[PDB]
């Protein structure tokens, strides 16, 4: 609950911040897909590292470690 909560205006504005003014309508589902894959990998690694450390709360340093991979 839920990838569809990443809205069309959010996506246009992210593309805009990256210097892209015009996008295909197909970009909405493309961005959703890319984002889900990125989070699946980072979250997996962040939580794995929290578990290796025998902790129950994922911290900013756990996320930073995950990102570094």
């Amino acid at each position: 609950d839920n990838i569809q909560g990443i809205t069309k205006p959010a996506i246009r504005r992210l593309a805009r911040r990256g210097g892209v003014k015009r996008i295909s309508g197909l970009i909405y589902e493309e961005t959703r897909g890319v984002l889900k894959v990125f989070l699946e990998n980072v979250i997996r690694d962040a939580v794995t590292y929290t578990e290796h450390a025998k902790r129950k709360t994922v911290t900013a340093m756990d996320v930073v470690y995950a990102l570094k991979r």
Binding site: L14, G19, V20, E30, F38, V47, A60
Partner: protein, 76 residues
């Protein structure tokens, strides 16, 4: 500054976490969920910049999914 609303983002993060964990009790520091969102948005921004280099390489001004897929492929 962040473009995605924090609540939709946190619901998506938690959902992905639970699918990985299959119910092991974890929780997130607010500063953790923020770090994650900040890095996610920066990732999307820089991917948009890379993919737009390919749009221009194809002689276009409109980003197509092939531009984003090629950028992803070349990234890794």
């Amino acid at each position: 500054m962040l473009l995605i609303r924090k609540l939709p983002f946190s619901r998506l993060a938690r959902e992905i976490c639970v699918k990985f964990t299959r119910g092991v009790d974890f929780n997130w520091q607010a500063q953790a969920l923020l770090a994650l969102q900040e890095a996610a948005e920066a990732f999307l921004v820089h991917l948009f910049e890379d993919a737009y280099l390919l749009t221009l390489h194809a002689g276009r001004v409109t980003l197509f999914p092939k531009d984003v897929q090629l950028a992803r492929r070349i990234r890794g």
